[PDB]
Amino acid sequence: NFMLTQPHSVSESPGKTVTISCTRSSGSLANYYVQWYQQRPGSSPTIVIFANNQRPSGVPDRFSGSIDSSSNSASLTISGLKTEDEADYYCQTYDPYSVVFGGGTKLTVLGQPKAAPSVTLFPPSSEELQANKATLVCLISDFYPGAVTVAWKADSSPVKAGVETTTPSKQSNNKYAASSYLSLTPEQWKSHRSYSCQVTHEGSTVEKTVAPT
Amino acid sequence: NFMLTQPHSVSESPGKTVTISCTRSSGSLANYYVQWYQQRPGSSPTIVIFANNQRPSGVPDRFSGSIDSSSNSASLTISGLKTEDEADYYCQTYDPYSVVFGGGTKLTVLGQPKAAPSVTLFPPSSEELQANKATLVCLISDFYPGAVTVAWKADSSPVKAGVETTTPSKQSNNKYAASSYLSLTPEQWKSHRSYSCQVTHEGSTVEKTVAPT
Amino acid sequence: EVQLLESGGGLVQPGGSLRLSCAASGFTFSSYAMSWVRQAPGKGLEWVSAISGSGGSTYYADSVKGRFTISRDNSKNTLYLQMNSLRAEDTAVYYCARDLIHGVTRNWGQGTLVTVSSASTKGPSVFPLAPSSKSTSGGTAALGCLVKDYFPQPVTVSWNSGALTSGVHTFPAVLQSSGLYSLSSVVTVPSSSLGTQTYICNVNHKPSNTKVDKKVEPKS
Amino acid sequence: EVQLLESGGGLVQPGGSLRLSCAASGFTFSSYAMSWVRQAPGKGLEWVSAISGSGGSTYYADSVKGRFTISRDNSKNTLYLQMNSLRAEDTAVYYCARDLIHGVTRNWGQGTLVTVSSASTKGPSVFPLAPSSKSTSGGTAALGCLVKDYFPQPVTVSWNSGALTSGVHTFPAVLQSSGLYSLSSVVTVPSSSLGTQTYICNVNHKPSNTKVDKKVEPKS
Amino acid sequence: IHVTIPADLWDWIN
Amino acid sequence: VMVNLNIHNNPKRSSDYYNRSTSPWNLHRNEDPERYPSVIWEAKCRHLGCINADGNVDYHMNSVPIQQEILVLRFRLEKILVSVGCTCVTPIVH
Amino acid sequence: NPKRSSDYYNRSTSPWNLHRNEDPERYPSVIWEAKCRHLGCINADGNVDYHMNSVPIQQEILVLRNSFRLEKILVSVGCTCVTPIVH
Ligand SMILES: CNC(=O)[C@H]1Cc2ccc(cc2)NC(=O)[C@@H](NC(=O)c2ccnn2C)Cc2cc(ccc2Cl)-c2cccc(c2)CCC(=O)N1
User: Fold this and answer.
1) Which DSSP letter does residue B58 get?
2) Nearest residue CA, atom 21 of ligand 1?
3) Collapsing DSSP states into helix, strand and coil, what is residue C161?
């Protein structure tokens, strides 16, 4: 067996040339064809390069593949880098029995405008309260970059128990979204004056508050 | 179409290295395999080299083939040259439509010892005389080098009319053979005291004589 | 056009079995080596198995040897993956792939999700997230639906049977410590449309055959 | 062992036709491209024609285009060369050859001689060359056969039906000004064997369908 | 004796 | 003998090796109404050489047809030779 | 036996072995089938090259199986060499 090592992540600025390397641990890289795949969020992988340097129809001329036998590595080169090139890239090769994929490289294109999140907080519904449950829903949308901090307060006290927060993910408009849920008993909900969801992004904090009845 | 040029003759002493070149006039030599054949006197050609440098089993290690794309030529090299390597050598190649042989190269192994001829002279048989014909047969063999002078005498007088002599031919042992025939009428045969076949080789002469009845 | 359509994915308990299929069209199926590759959510691509065009040669990742069997039916243009002795770590989207030669993949299917878990199928409870003065500012109101505690993935949400698309935001699901998923869907609407336009969220959780149409209205 | 045996050679008048055959054995004939190559006396090798293993592709030298046809019978393991409109320049030994690929010849036959001439066939007159005290060298004596005035070549000579090979010397033929050939064959034998052992030269001249067995004995 | 033959073969015979 | 028979109910569409091979081939229709089957598809090698790593016809090797002896109906059962596809042969065996 | 009729199985860049498939309930009883020797093809240097694959060339042939039935069967006749780049 063998492994393929790729960098976990690469960040580059638009219009520049980016190189993603793929190093084979054992076996001669030049004895077996190398393929490169692009994978966008929630999509099937697509082929960018096959047989070391073959570019299928529909793949822009900006993408090219090469191999370096001395370093036992393959490279994917993207010239004139565009924001639409942001995706995960995987190299792949084989030996006479096995097929191996590299760990993948997250490609980030820099210089994109910062966007503040819209935050909306909902209290528990009457229906859920009647079923002896209570969920507070804090929705966070249209923010860039993806880094966000979510904190909950019961009145003024920080709360960590019962909180479940998603890792942020890109929306169709290339901005991020996330949600945070606070599970309470109806008794905990009714015994406090209010609950708050505090959202911190790029050093600024927004706080939304809800109250029983 | 194309042609292959080989030298008309190559010469070297025993134990030395000989090279026979084969130059292609048109088309890239490296695009088509080159074969080399050896042809001994009165024999079918045999394979020395095929596919540029492949030596079949039975062919001594001393024979090797190579190609030179820079000069558009192929070469047959014989190391540790032996007296048994004397023969004609032909290169051969092809294109998608034709097959072409070079003109052939006569290989001479120099420094071979001078060898005196063995001469046998036969008079006309009784059977031939009865059929009103008479042929004297002078057989010459095992001489080296190939040049030989054959003269006929009727008693002591030189004879040129009725004589047919072969050009010397190379034997399997590198020595040469020749034959000379003297055609007479039975009357010419019976009217002389004797006839002689005089064979001169390297300044030395062997004379054989026959007499009627 | 090359088409690869996977089917057979679903929820199975550890030790269980599942057979995946891949229906191929748009190419001479019998002359192509085929493979299965999987991907666990938020993880990398992992090769599973490969089979020659004739089906005479098969290849397996060490992680699946003796448990999975790749096969093909060249008369039906179908590739199969028989998965026995399943474990939690086999949970992934499984992709069918066409190979030009062994190890050179040229086309991928859309994938089929395989979930291996001791947890059973659970349909969600759907609650309205009513618009109010706290979900309203700058002439817009936010209203939504909370799709609570379902398993396995996925769920789909539409608004007003797909007639409402502008201002819709369906959030990715949270995976809770209980092992169940929850998600929310919100729509931002003109505040003057509240109590004039009906807003209904259409929730479908195919794995549990649950379809819920929840009316979302201001509370009074 | 690879064997290629040519037949069909002999004398043809200018403008005449002749068909050569090559019987092959010791290899899977149908999977080899085959060729004909010729050689005029004292001249170089000249490629004539080639045919693929299946017989579906044929190739010809410019010197023989239109006049010659190469063909093969894979059920009989035979290669043929049909020659029409023959001219004196076609006079040569014709060799059958086995090719590993087009243009790479690996094996040669023994050849068949084709003579294109308006001169007529003439079978040989064979005379004994009797041993005597003048042909003796102590313990050894020379005796022979004179093969006079034949056309075309070749003649073959054996002694005692091939039981006698040691000490045999068959000389190359003389081409006379009349256009006829003559040759001699001599054998060196023990002097003590004279008038005890019978010595017969076997002369074969296939072009005139003539075979002569001439007894050679001491004259007394 | 019974021989199961396809429809394309029978049409060719008759 | 009494035969009491019972009636029961193009390679380009089945395989594309003809186009992907280093010794590619074309398929030719051999028609004969007096023979069953009426149409027989036969392989004919496209080139004398084989396609090398650079995409050129290479004459260091040859494309050759792979033939199979098959019985056919004409009634009389006859043995016929058909080319199924091509392979690449070289003069050096390893 | 095909070994006695043709030796392309040994001279091909995608060489093959011939295996006997025996069936008494089928006519012919013995069918020789080609099995590619290597996954790759033999390159210019004599090595198995995995930038190409040896693949069997299969032919649909009718076979016979008091009662008989004419059946369509697929048999490997030989191997060819395929590459992922078409020129
Ligand atoms: C090394 N060789 C082997 O192992 C086998 C391999 C083989 C096996 C079977 C076939 C051919 C080849 N069959 C056909 O050709 C059939 N026809 C077609 O499929 C057909 C016609 C036109 N297009 N096709 C596609 C007719 C038929 C033939 C025979 C039996 C039943 C039937 Cl239905 C039969 C009897 C005796 C001998 C042989 C064949 C030949 C030697 C042998 O044993 N050869």
Assistant:
1) T
2) F72
3) helix
Length of chain G: 87
Domain D119-220: CATH class, spelled out: mainly beta
d(CA B93, CA D136): 52
Pick the residue whose CA is nearest to atom 37 on ligand 1.
G28
The residue ranges of every structural domain in chain D are 1-118, 119-220
Tell which phi-psi region holds residue G73, choosing left (phi > 0), alpha (psi between -120 and 50) or beta: beta
């030179």: which residue's tokens?
A: B68
Residues of D within 8 A of F83 (CB-CB) are: 54
- Enumerate residues 6+ apart whose C-beta is below 8 A from D156: D203, D204
Q: Could you tell me which residues come within 8 angstroms of residue A203 by beta carbon, excluding any fewer than 6 positions away?
A: none
d(CA D201, CA D126): 9
Dist. CA D72–CA D78, nearest whole Å: 6
The beta strands (E) that lie in chain D are given as: 3-7, 10-12, 18-25, 33-39, 45-51, 58-60, 68-73, 78-83, 92-99, 105-108, 112-116, 125-129, 136-137, 140-150, 156-159, 168-170, 174-175, 181-190, 199-205, 210-216
CA C105 to chain centre: 23
F91–chain B Cβ distance below 8 A for any pair = yes
Q: Is A84 helix (H, G, I), strand (E, B) or coil?
A: helix
Nearest CA in chain F to E7: F7
The CATH number assigned to the domain with range D1-118 reads 2.60.40.10
* Domains defined along chain B, listed by start: 1-111 (2.60.40.10), 112-212 (2.60.40.10)
**Residues in chain F followed by a break, C to N above 2.5 angstroms:** 9, 74
Question: 3-state class of G12 per DSSP?
Answer: strand
Cα–Cα distances in angstroms (integers) from residue A199 to residues A141, A172, C19, D137, in the given order: 11, 22, 45, 127
In terms of C-beta density within 10 A (0-12 exposed, 13-18 middle, 19 or more buried), how is residue D101 classed? buried
**Residue B127 to residue G40: CA distance in whole angstroms:** 76
Nearest Cα to F64, choosing from F49, F54, F81?
F49
Q: Does residue F39 have its Cβ closer than 6 Å to ligand 1?
A: no
The amino acid present at F27, given as its one-letter code, is: L
Torsion of CA A190, A192, A193, A195, to 10 degrees: -100
User: Is the C-beta atom of F34 inside 6 A of ligand 1?
Assistant: no
What is the domain partition of chain G in residue ranges?
1-87
Task: Give which of C200, C196, C198, C217 is closest to C135, Cα–Cα.
Answer: C217
The one-letter amino acid code at B122 reads F
Q: Are the C-beta atoms of C54 and C28 separated by less than 8 Å?
A: no
**C1-118 against C119-220: fold identical:** yes
Q: Would you identify the CATH topology of the domain G1-87?
A: Cystine Knot Cytokines, subunit B (2.10.90)
Ligand 1 contacts CB of residue G74 (under 6 A) = no
Which method resolved this structure? X-ray
Instruction: Compute the distance between CA of residue A190 and CA of residue C170 in angstroms, rounded to an integer.
Output: 29
User: Between chains, do B96 and F49 touch, taking CB under 8 Å as contact?
Assistant: yes
The answer to whether B28 and B72 are in contact (CB under 8 A) is: yes
- Do you find a cis peptide bond into F37, omega within 30 degrees of 0? yes
Chain B residues whose beta carbon lies within 8 Å of the beta carbon of residue D106: 47, 50, 56
- Tell me if C18 sits within 8 A of C86, measured CB to CB: yes
> DSSP assignment of D33-63, as one string?
EEEEEEE-TTS-EEEEEEE-SSS--EEE-GG
> Which residue has 């229709």 as its token pair?
F29
* Cα distance from N-terminal residue to C-terminal residue, chain G: 36
Cα gap G75→A25, rounded to integer Å: 40
CATH classification number, F15-94, choose in 3.40.630.30, 3.40.50.150, 2.40.50.1070, 2.10.90.10: 2.10.90.10
Query: Which three-class secondary structure state does DSSP give residue B161?
Result: coil
